[PDB]
Design a protein around this ligand. Structure first.
Ligand SMILES: *C(=O)[C@H](CCCNC(=N)N)NC(=O)CN1C(=O)[C@@H](NS(=O)(=O)Cc2ccccc2)N=C(c2ccccc2)c2ccccc21
Length: 247
């Protein structure tokens, strides 16, 4: 997160931190996610497309720091990794950038809601917040595009939901942005999500309730003027989410 401020997991109890085991004995932070049900976490497919092996991932709930410990946190293994079939990437954009992860601890149990761990509500079938609404975003991502290290403390910030009319126009992006995407940015272009924030939640007020409106997906740079962040439009994927979280 460029700009914004440092906070704790209590401000975003639904935030899941995803880690991966690499070749050579190293473990690194990959992306963020959101707890939609006690056993289900939603993220972006591009976070796993290059390394589709579910046994190499580790999920943390209730974690406010990247390395040091936070009391009340819970470690989880990935029982099932579901990537969207129609996923495809260009040099311009990611498409159908959404993924589901079924988590389970060592005892085979799911998440236990606490003051630091809670699920986020999903939007209603084709019912998004009105454009111009203030939404929150979180993650352990970069504070500057140029940085090589991710911050140690969780960050969050606020951005404005932008209409497709605006985002789809050439003064911003173009044809690459579809109705399955949502754009949001800071009208002053000082705060935004960045590398390391992918898979994270874009939370907005829907029916006077905090709702998962989008998933951090892509953008040209980070906090670049006239280049808004692009999120996966969760509401346009409800049938998909429901059919995969059945039995
Ligand atoms: C998390 O993984 C990031 C979150 C970005 C949010 N950015 C923002 N709010 N302004 N997602 C990616 O980095 C995915 N990308 C890119 O977004 C890409 N932007 S792009 O090249 O201008 C157009 C594009 C290309 C390919 C896929 C999607 C969009 N930038 C990348 C990048 C650039 C420099 C350093 C690291 C990463 C990039 C590179 C490879 C694949 C995807 C992405």
């Amino acid at each position: 997160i460029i700009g914004g401020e440092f906070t704790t997991i209590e401000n975003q109890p639904w935030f899941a931190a995803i880690y991966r085991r690499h070749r050579g004995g190293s473990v690194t932070y990959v992306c963020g996610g959101s707890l939609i049900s006690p056993c289900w976490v939603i993220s972006a497919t591009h976070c796993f497309i290059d390394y589709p092996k579910k046994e190499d991932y580790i999920v943390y709930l209730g974690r406010s720091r990247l390395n040091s410990n936070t009391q009340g946190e819970m470690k989880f293994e990935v029982e099932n990794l579901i990537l969207h079939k129609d996923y495809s990437a260009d040099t311009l954009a990611h498409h159908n950038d959404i993924a589901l992860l079924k988590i389970r601890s060592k005892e085979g149990r799911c998440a236990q809601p606490s003051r630091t761990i809670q699920t986020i509500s999903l939007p209603s079938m084709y019912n998004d917040p009105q454009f111009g609404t203030s939404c929150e975003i979180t993650g352990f991502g970069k504070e500057n595009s140029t940085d090589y290290l991710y911050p140690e403390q969780l960050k969050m910030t606020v951005v404005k939901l932008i209409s497709h009319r605006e985002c789809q126009q050439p003064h911003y992006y173009g044809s690459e942005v579809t109705t399955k995407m949502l754009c949001a940015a800071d009208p002053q272009w000082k705060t935004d999500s960045c590398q390391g924030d992918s898979g994270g939640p874009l939370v907005c007020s829907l029916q006077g309730r905090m709702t998962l409106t989008g998933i951090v997906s892509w953008g040209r740079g980070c906090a670049l003027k006239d280049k808004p962040g692009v999120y996966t439009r969760v509401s346009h994927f409800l049938p998909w989410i429901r059919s995969h979280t059945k039995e």
